[PDB]
Design an enzyme around this catalytic site. Structure first.
Site, PDB file in Angstrom:
ATOM      1  N   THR A 158      -6.394 -48.950 -23.429  1.00  0.00           N
ATOM      2  CA  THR A 158      -5.176 -49.107 -24.217  1.00  0.00           C
ATOM      3  C   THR A 158      -5.233 -48.540 -25.626  1.00  0.00           C
ATOM      4  OG1 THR A 158      -4.638 -51.007 -22.915  1.00  0.00           O
ATOM      5  CG2 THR A 158      -3.493 -50.848 -24.984  1.00  0.00           C
ATOM      6  N   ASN A 179     -12.043 -50.026 -25.815  1.00  0.00           N
ATOM      7  CA  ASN A 179     -11.490 -51.338 -26.161  1.00  0.00           C
ATOM      8  C   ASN A 179     -12.566 -52.249 -26.781  1.00  0.00           C
ATOM      9  OD1 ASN A 179      -8.698 -50.836 -25.616  1.00  0.00           O
ATOM     10  ND2 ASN A 179      -8.933 -51.697 -23.493  1.00  0.00           N
ATOM     11  N   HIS A 264      -3.345 -56.013 -13.572  1.00  0.00           N
ATOM     12  CA  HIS A 264      -4.696 -56.493 -13.526  1.00  0.00           C
ATOM     13  C   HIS A 264      -4.859 -57.643 -12.511  1.00  0.00           C
ATOM     14  CE1 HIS A 264      -6.909 -54.371 -16.653  1.00  0.00           C
ATOM     15  NE2 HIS A 264      -5.867 -54.502 -17.443  1.00  0.00           N
ATOM     16  N   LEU A 687     -17.219 -27.514 -30.625  1.00  0.00           N
ATOM     17  CA  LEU A 687     -16.923 -26.340 -31.416  1.00  0.00           C
ATOM     18  C   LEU A 687     -18.096 -25.384 -31.429  1.00  0.00           C
ATOM     19  CD1 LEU A 687     -15.604 -28.371 -34.523  1.00  0.00           C
ATOM     20  CD2 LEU A 687     -14.224 -27.340 -32.721  1.00  0.00           C
TER      21      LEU A 687
END
Ligand SMILES: *[C@@H]1O[C@H](CO)[C@@H](O[C@@H]2O[C@H](CO)[C@@H](O[C@@H]3O[C@H](CO[C@H]4O[C@H](CO)[C@@H](O)[C@H](O[C@H]5O[C@H](CO)[C@@H](O)[C@H](O)[C@@H]5O[C@H]5O[C@H](CO)[C@@H](O)[C@H](O)[C@@H]5O)[C@@H]4O)[C@@H](O)[C@H](O[C@H]4O[C@H](CO)[C@@H](O)[C@H](O)[C@@H]4O[C@H]4O[C@H](CO)[C@@H](O)[C@H](O)[C@@H]4O)[C@@H]3O)[C@H](O)[C@H]2NC(C)=O)[C@H](O)[C@H]1NC(C)=O
Ligand code: XEI
Ligand code: CA
Ligand code: CA
Ligand code: CL
Ligand code: NA
Ligand code: NA
Ligand code: ZN
Length: 802
Positions: A158, A179, A264, A687
């Site tokens: 989330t 999370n 869930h 990079l």
């Protein structure tokens, strides 16, 4: 907190007041600092959320949650169905779709507002599977601009994804990498439960609300406390929109905990999921009826977006590290749909990551996780360059969990979870854009959520902070406010060396059995070396080098290369393989042939003796000798300037790609253009490394060892047209393969390469843009396509999901 100050007149205040002044912003609940009368004044519920015929024209009672009185519209606090119940208006969902060509806004609006309507765990396939019970969402989708799905970032949790939406940044760069997190520099932990997550040092980059404020555009709150009901969040947004011009925000967020919360408990498609989808649709209806009452339904741009999807996951599909490791008490695991491992104590010098990795590698025949050092994870995940990401990572199979030991799981709760690899179909989420600035009834291809920040900035007239989106690649979503980027300027121009060195000036330890000898064909080979076939092999122009360096263009019959004098190998090699091309073998007389390239000094060349001495390192070729056009052209493929360092384990991969897969793709796609080359990313930042960052050389030499090898495989989207004669849009797939001295990643690697190489390559699929970052090259400079379309092409990811 001095909590007997009042929230009167201050409910859901946009500006934060500092202690000991009590707070009436939402967030006050999250700090436990609201004034005494917050619930009474700001969370009114009396009489509920809907007008009824008996309430129409009532006398205003300030106790009510919303109003059906005559003055409500001017005040901006009517129930959202007021005009429907009391004035004979239709619900927004019952109105025909009508194109919004221009914003139709009240006087005083300087720009169309943006409302970001975010829904937790809204999996992409809900749009089709739940269509009968979501008529407001289906109207937004079909009348607006929509993608079949949107790709989240990894991990598909989330906060990483919502903060990516807000910033345009990969989790590694914004800092919210899960999370749950430990930052060793702070010596502090971030958790969902509790309050350390509200500390600002976690949250990097520049989120949209700060971007807006700094540039003079006001913003509503982005965070809603769980105890504020959805109806109140909507009514609060609608009230804000009724503010005077100098106070009214131009950007707003709504957030729903559904359908994730239920997903869930019941799984993505449990029968109990129908109701949460209905209720979300009802909330969208309330917003749209509300906007319509305020004459803003053809003024506001609405984004309906999810953070991630949801997969079927149960307790019994858990792998336990206690079944692999004897030392399980010496580690900390961040568990679940990914694994992150570090030492339980940094004073335990016994702990060794290498032995942990080996104890976790290919131990059970259907093992449902794979260990990685973080630098070896697929580059497409961009999940490494942050101190909060532990060195050891476990990528967990979809439908599974990893845990440290069985007591953690049983001391079953859940049927759904998310967090997996962001190419997994079940993790994909949604995007719909509706409003004056979005296109009408338009479907766009799937795209990554890192791209949205730029678009939200475009929607608001803002200059975006530096981010990982490719600004312009989503111009096709927009009716107007497109961003018109220019191609980056080439920094280094190439040298075009002719024949400058005699064979006897090279002492490289190389041999080639190549001594045997025309006048027609003497001019013919001169012309190939001057670039006469280059329009066949360099279809989209030469890549531009976007940094300061020294390099040469080298032409040949079958391929063209940009050869770096600094790295002693090509930065890129380009070649076209037609549908009709044939594969030939490396003849015996050339098996260990390496030939000096008389256009390039001995001093800027590799040498065979270094490879002989380096017992770990061998070499391969960027243009494959197997696909030479003629016996005579095959000699070119053995130039020392086409050679690159390769571990023997990697040669198995590479030779299979070159000998079998390239020809297969040419047959399937009606020819392909291939650009291949090396990548050096020793500090795993995604990079291009400078020369002074390189950690490994071929023993005894200055020949630097790549960390990865790329290839970009381009053809005609209309496959009835051959790659080399394509009039329209292109089709691309690419990869960035890790250059590893073993094949431990591939559990089936003792078998023939036809059983495991392709699966490896699919795992390491990449965007052209990922390769640009990693090389400092800019591709597709000379096409007949629009630059925005090329930008979209450079962000494409071939995912290989069925
Ligand atoms: C995705 O997009 C993003 C954004 O465009 C890209 O990330 C950028 O990459 C840039 C190039 O590496 C990087 O530029 C560096 O900035 C340093 C200053 O940084 C601070 O200020 C900026 C601007 O406000 C801010 O954005 C930064 O925020 C980071 O750090 C904070 C605090 O930790 C975090 O909260 C936040 O999440 C963010 O973390 C991320 O970035 C850092 C690196 O900056 C990572 O370490 C983290 O893991 C995480 O990924 C900062 O608050 C600046 O110091 C650098 O300059 C050095 O380099 C050259 C060398 O020649 C020189 O000109 C300078 O003088 C300096 O050299 C000296 O210092 C060296 C380093 O200490 C030292 O070793 C030498 O010996 C020298 O003496 C550098 O310019 C930019 O900050 C980030 N921005 C962000 C937001 O991440 C990202 O690359 C993109 N990804 C891809 C794949 O394309
Ligand atoms: C749309 C959005 C919402 C959002 O949070 C919504 C939220 C999450 C959890 C509890 N309650 C909530 O309201 C955030 C964060 C960064 C503040 C998490 C960003 C965006 C963006 N862009
Ligand atoms: Ca979520
Ligand atoms: Ca690097
Ligand atoms: Cl996590
Ligand atoms: Na060797
Ligand atoms: Na193996
Ligand atoms: Zn969840």
């Amino acid at each position: 907190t001095a909590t007997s100050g009042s929230c009167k007149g201050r409910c859901f205040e946009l500006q934060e007041v500092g202690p000991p002044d009590c707070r009436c912003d939402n967030l006050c609940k999250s700090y436990s600092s609201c004034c005494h009368d917050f619930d009474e004044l700001c969370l009114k519920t009396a009489r509920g959320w809907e007008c009824t015929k008996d309430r129409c024209g009532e006398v205003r009672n300030e106790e009510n949650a919303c109003h059906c009185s005559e003055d409500c519209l001017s005040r901006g606090d009517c129930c959202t169905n007021y005009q429907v119940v009391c004035k004979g208006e239709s619900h927004w969902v019952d109105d025909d779709c009508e194109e919004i060509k221009v914003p139709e806004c009240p006087a005083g609006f300087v720009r169309p507002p943006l409302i970001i309507f975010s829904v937790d765990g809204f999996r992409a396939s809900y749009m089709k599977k739940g269509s009968k019970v979501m008529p407001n969402i289906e109207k937004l989708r079909s009348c607006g601009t929509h993608a079949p799905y949107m790709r989240p970032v990894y991990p598909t949790k989330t906060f990483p994804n919502l903060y990516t939406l807000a910033t345009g940044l990969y989790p590694e760069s914004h800092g919210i990498v899960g999370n749950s997190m430990y930052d060793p520099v702070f010596d502090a932990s971030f958790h969902l439960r509790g309050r350390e997550k509200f500390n600002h040092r976690w949250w990097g980059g520049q989120p949209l609300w700060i971007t807006a404020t700094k540039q003079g555009v006001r913003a509503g709150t982005f965070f809603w406390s769980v105890s504020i009901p959805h109806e109140r969040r909507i009514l609060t947004i609608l009230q804000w929109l009724s503010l005077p011009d100098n106070e009214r925000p131009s950007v707003y967020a709504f957030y729903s905990e559904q359908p994730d919360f239920s997903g869930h408990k019941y799984g993505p498609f449990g029968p109990e999921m129908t109701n949460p989808l209905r209720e979300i649709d009802k909330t969208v209806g309330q917003l749209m009826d509300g906007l319509k009452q305020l004459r803003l339904h053809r003024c506001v741009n609405v984004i309906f977006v999810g953070d991630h999807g949801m997969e079927d996951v149960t307790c019994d599909r858990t792998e336990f590290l206690s079944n692999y490791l004897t030392n399980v008490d010496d580690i900390t695991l961040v568990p679940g749909t990914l694994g992150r491992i570090r030492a339980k104590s940094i004073n335990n010098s016994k702990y060794d990551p290498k032995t942990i990795i080996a104890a976790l590698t290919c131990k059970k025949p259907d093992q449902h996780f794979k260990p990685y050092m973080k630098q070896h994870l697929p580059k497409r995940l961009h999940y490494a360059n942050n101190r909060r990401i532990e060195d050891i990572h476990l990528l967990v199979d979809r439908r599974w969990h990893v845990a440290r030991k069985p007591l953690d799981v049983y001391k079953c709760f859940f049927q759904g979870d998310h967090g997996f690899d962001n190419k997994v179909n079940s993790m994909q989420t949604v995007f719909v854009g509706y409003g004056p600035t979005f296109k009408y009834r338009t479907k766009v291809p799937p795209f990554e959520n890192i791209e949205l920040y730029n678009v939200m900035c475009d929607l608001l007239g803002l200059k975006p902070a530096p981010n990982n989106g490719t600004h312009g690649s989503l111009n096709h979503l927009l009716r107007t406010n497109t961003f018109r980027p220019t191609m980056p300027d080439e920094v280094s121009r190439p040298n075009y060396p002719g024949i400058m060195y005699l064979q006897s000036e090279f002492d490289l330890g190389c041999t080639c059995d190549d001594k045997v000898e025309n006048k027609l064909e003497e001019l013919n080979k001169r012309l190939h070396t001057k670039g006469s076939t280059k329009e066949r092999h360099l279809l989209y122009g030469r890549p531009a080098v976007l940094y300061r360096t020294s390099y040469d263009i080298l032409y040949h019959t079958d391929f063209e290369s940009g050869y770096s004098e600094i790295f002693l190998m090509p930065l890129w090699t380009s070649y076209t393989i037609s549908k009709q091309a044939e594969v030939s073998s490396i003849p015996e007389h050339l098996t260990n042939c390496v030939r000096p390239d008389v256009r390039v000094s001995p001093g800027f060349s590799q040498n065979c003796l270094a490879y002989k001495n380096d017992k770990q390192m061998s070499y391969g070729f960027l243009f494959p000798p197997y696909l030479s056009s003629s016996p005579e052209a095959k000699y070119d493929a053995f130039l020392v300037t086409n050679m690159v360092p390769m571990y023997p384990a990697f040669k198995r991969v590479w030779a299979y790609f070159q000998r079998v897969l390239v020809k297969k793709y040419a047959s399937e796609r009606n020819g392909v253009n291939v650009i291949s080359g090396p990548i050096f990313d020793y500090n795993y930042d995604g990079l291009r490394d400078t020369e002074d960052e390189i950690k490994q050389y071929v023993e005894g030499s200055s020949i630097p060892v790549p960390t990865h090898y790329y290839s970009i495989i381009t053809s005609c989207l209309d496959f009835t047209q051959p790659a080399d004669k394509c009039d329209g849009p292109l089709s691309v797939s690419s990869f960035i393969l890790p250059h590893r001295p073993d094949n431990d990643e591939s559990c089936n690697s003792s078998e023939d390469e036809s059983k495991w190489v392709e699966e490896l390559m699919k795992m390491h699929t990449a965007r052209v843009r990922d390769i640009e970052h990693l090389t400092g090259l800019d591709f597709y400079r000379k096409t007949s396509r629009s630059y925005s379309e090329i930008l979209t092409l450079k962000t494409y990811l071939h995912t290989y999901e069925s």
